[PDB]
Design an enzyme around this catalytic site. Structure first.
Site, mmCIF file in Angstrom:
data_model
loop_
_atom_site.group_PDB
_atom_site.id
_atom_site.type_symbol
_atom_site.label_atom_id
_atom_site.label_comp_id
_atom_site.label_asym_id
_atom_site.label_seq_id
_atom_site.Cartn_x
_atom_site.Cartn_y
_atom_site.Cartn_z
ATOM 1 N N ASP A 1 16.683 51.005 72.708
ATOM 2 C CA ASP A 1 15.603 51.956 72.479
ATOM 3 C C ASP A 1 16.130 53.111 71.624
ATOM 4 O O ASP A 1 16.783 54.029 72.138
ATOM 5 C CB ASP A 1 15.078 52.441 73.824
ATOM 6 C CG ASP A 1 13.963 53.467 73.674
ATOM 7 O OD1 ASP A 1 13.461 53.593 72.545
ATOM 8 O OD2 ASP A 1 13.616 54.142 74.672
ATOM 9 N N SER B 1 8.167 59.292 55.762
ATOM 10 C CA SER B 1 7.672 58.272 54.857
ATOM 11 C C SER B 1 6.908 58.925 53.709
ATOM 12 O O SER B 1 6.264 59.959 53.868
ATOM 13 C CB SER B 1 6.761 57.294 55.617
ATOM 14 O OG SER B 1 6.124 56.363 54.751
#
Length: 330
Positions: A35, A199
């Site tokens: 994770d 992004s």
């Protein structure tokens, strides 16, 4: 040193991925959910409330000759999905794919919430975010990656998750046979303890690319892709009959649909998530309404590049003094 381990979807939907981890002496092998969105290595154990164990493999520290109770240390964690666990702490030897850390904090669960009990395939979590998020008190502990970093050939790990298929986590090296083209690296903020990056935009299907900054986290521990409501609305508007359902808890679409791809920007580069990766199947057995793999982050507080996005790429988690992320197509 290096390590290399295969990671395997737990079910036919890729709801999560499990990776075998050797704990203790002699080894006890548990299948952990790696994770990158959390920083605790915790396991089902011989200390877990018996009613809260339902088929998981447990770590028994009393059977490990290298286990040592970390005196006074406790841990307690709550995840973005509402699940939680808590317990005490041992140090022991932990190996992943041939890479061994001595003295790793292994957090032994005394309590787990129902979602962990109900998932017999996941024996614990292995956190790979930054150690500043580790919940051990009163002495915070380091992640497996942080403990191994100095010994690794290169201070990196890579995630290569499969679509409906096994993939790989590598430590200490970048497998140049595992991706196509070049790896595009992008800046990381560690301010929230996450692999947080920005992004450069998105496209829906064959549509034109929208240049826009989307801050979010690379999180292998989250199934879906969570993005701003404007982006998610733009995606699902390309799917006839798709709608946001409050009763179901997100966007659903006719199981008869063919979904468009979703492209996200990494600097000047582009990663394409095929449409099939965004289908998470009937909302309930036999339903013709299917659950979407792109969902709004409006209720979270953060955008999450979860497995839906990451499994479309070869992803480099670069733990150099200034961390960065790298993405390649594959």
């Amino acid at each position: 040193s290096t390590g290399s381990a295969t990671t395997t979807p737990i079910d036919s939907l890729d709801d999560a991925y499990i990776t075998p981890v050797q704990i203790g002496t002699p080894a006890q092998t548990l299948n952990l959910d790696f994770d990158t969105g959390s920083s605790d290595l915790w396991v089902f154990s011989s200390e877990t409330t018996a009613s809260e164990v339902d088929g998981q493999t447990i770590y028994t520290p009393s059977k490990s000759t290298t286990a040592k109770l970390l005196s006074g240390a406790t841990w307690s964690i709550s995840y973005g999905d509402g699940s939680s666990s808590s317990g005490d702490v041992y140090t022991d030897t932990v190996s992943v794919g041939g890479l061994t850390v001595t003295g790793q904090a292994v957090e032994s669960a005394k309590k787990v919430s129902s979602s962990f009990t109900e998932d017999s395939t996941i024996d614990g979590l292995l956190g790979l975010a930054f150690s500043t998020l580790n919940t051990v008190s009163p002495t915070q502990q380091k992640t497996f990656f942080d403990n191994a970093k100095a010994s690794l050939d290169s201070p990196v790990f890579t995630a290569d998750l499969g679509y409906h298929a096994p993939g790989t986590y590598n430590f200490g090296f970048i497998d140049t046979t595992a991706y196509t083209g070049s790896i595009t690296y992008t800046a990381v903020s560690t301010k929230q303890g996450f692999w947080e990056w920005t992004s450069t935009g998105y496209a829906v299907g064959s549509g034109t690319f929208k240049s826009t900054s989307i801050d979010g986290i690379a999180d292998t521990g989250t199934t879906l892709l969570y993005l701003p409501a404007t982006v998610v609305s733009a995606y699902w508007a390309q799917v006839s009959g798709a709608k946001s359902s409050s009763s179901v808890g997100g966007y659903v679409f006719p199981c008869s649909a063919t979904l468009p791809s979703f492209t996200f920007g990494v600097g000047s580069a582009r990663i394409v998530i095929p449409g099939d990766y965004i289908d998470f199947g009937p909302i309930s057995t036999g339903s013709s309404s299917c659950f979407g793999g792109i969902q709004s982050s409006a209720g979270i507080g953060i955008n999450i590049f979860g497995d839906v996005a990451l499994k479309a790429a070869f992803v480099v988690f670069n733990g150099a003094t200034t961390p960065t992320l790298g993405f390649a197509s594959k």
